[PDB]
Each structure stands twice: as structure tokens, then as C-alpha cells.
RNA sequence: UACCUGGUUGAUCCUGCCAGUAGCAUAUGCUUGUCUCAAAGAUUAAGCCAUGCAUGUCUAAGUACGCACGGCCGGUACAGU
């Protein structure tokens, strides 16, 4: 999930909130940046923060980031809370529509599973 | 640009320092076409010093008998310089 820095233009380039992430003694944390500042972290971050199209942050790590392994575990367990990060957007409640397991189920009554 | 990388082990995760990295100002090595700007015996010995120079000054208006120059003849405030 991205967002803005501080006002809209539309397309959104940056992380909504600031948010962190850790894996055993390591951790980021991602910080919001206004535009064309571009990816300001080290080589291992930089690699998937550019993938999710999150073209602008600031970013400071802390502990052992010697081990890798480590580091960008805990880099992908940041940038999965955006969505699990409530904001006052999402505050209006949602409808509950019906799952796709439930009116497809039709087609599934033959001897699928 | 709010950034890290190598090294303790058979292997792994830490603690921790060492090394790598960039700027700044002094010395030094090697090299060097053209253009502008210019810091420069402070670091150490506020150690010691040859020679040369670096503070003098007169307007119509303080004092002119320089045997100076000049004079158009002088002085009688008395010339001009």
C-alpha cells in the first residue's frame, strides 16, 4: 500500500505511514519522503522497495545487518503491515460481500475438491 | 541522499572492536597546455641579527641685513624668489 507525503497530485510514491519490521535483532525503519528523492537505503533494501514501486523513502537500520538472511526478512515484514496498519481512511465499515468459495460452489458439485 | 561492507566458527545467530568509505587542512611524491581569483616563517625559538629604507611639516597671512639668486633704486613694516 502506498501513499503520499503531504498533499495529492494523484499516484501515489512514497509509504503511507511509517512503519517497521523486525527479524531477530534486525530492523528498519521505513519513513515517508517527498518526491524525487529517490530510495535512500543500503544495496539489499534498495532492490525491493524498488520492485513495490515505492520510488521515495527514508529509511535507518539497527543491529547485526552483516547477516542478509536477516535483513531483508525484515525489510518484507515491513512493507506487509502497510495493509495491516489502520489509518483513518478505513474507518468507515466494510459490507461483508459474499466469498467466492460460496456462489461459485455450483460448478464444484461434481465430484471436485 | 536520514545508506553501510569485509574479518572470531565445521556451520548458525549475537556481543564487540579492528579494517574498508566520504569531507576538511598541513606536509610530501609524481605529473602539468590556456584563463581568472590569491593564501603564504603562526605551529618550532615573543631565538639572534649585517646593510638599506619605513614621520615629517609654510601659506597673501609668526621671525628673512644668507656677503644666496634677483634688482631697474630702494628699505622710509618693506619685494620677487
Excluded at 513495490?52 to 525489510?75: P, Q, V
Excluded at 496498519?85 to 460448478?107: A, I, R
Aim: proline letters at 6%.
Amino acid at each position: 500500500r502506498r501513499g503520499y507525503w503531504g498533499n495529492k497530485i494523484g499516484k501515489p510514491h512514497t509509504v503511507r505511514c511509517k512503519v517497521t519490521g523486525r527479524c531477530g535483532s534486525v530492523l528498519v525503519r521505513l519513513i515517508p519522503a517527498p518526491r524525487g528523492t529517490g530510495i535512500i537505503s543500503a544495496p539489499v533494501p534498495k532492490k525491493l522497495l524498488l520492485m513495490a514501486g515505492i520510488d521515495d523513502c527514508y529509511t535507518s537500520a539497527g543491529g547485526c545487518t552483516a547477516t542478509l538472511g536477516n535483513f531483508a526478512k525484515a525489510t518484507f515484514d515491513a512493507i506487509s503491515k502497510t495493509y495491516s496498519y489502520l489509518t483513518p481512511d478505513l474507518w468507515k465499515e466494510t459490507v461483508f460481500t459474499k466469498s467466492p468459495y460460496q456462489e461459485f460452489t455450483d460448478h464444484l458439485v461434481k465430484t471436485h475438491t
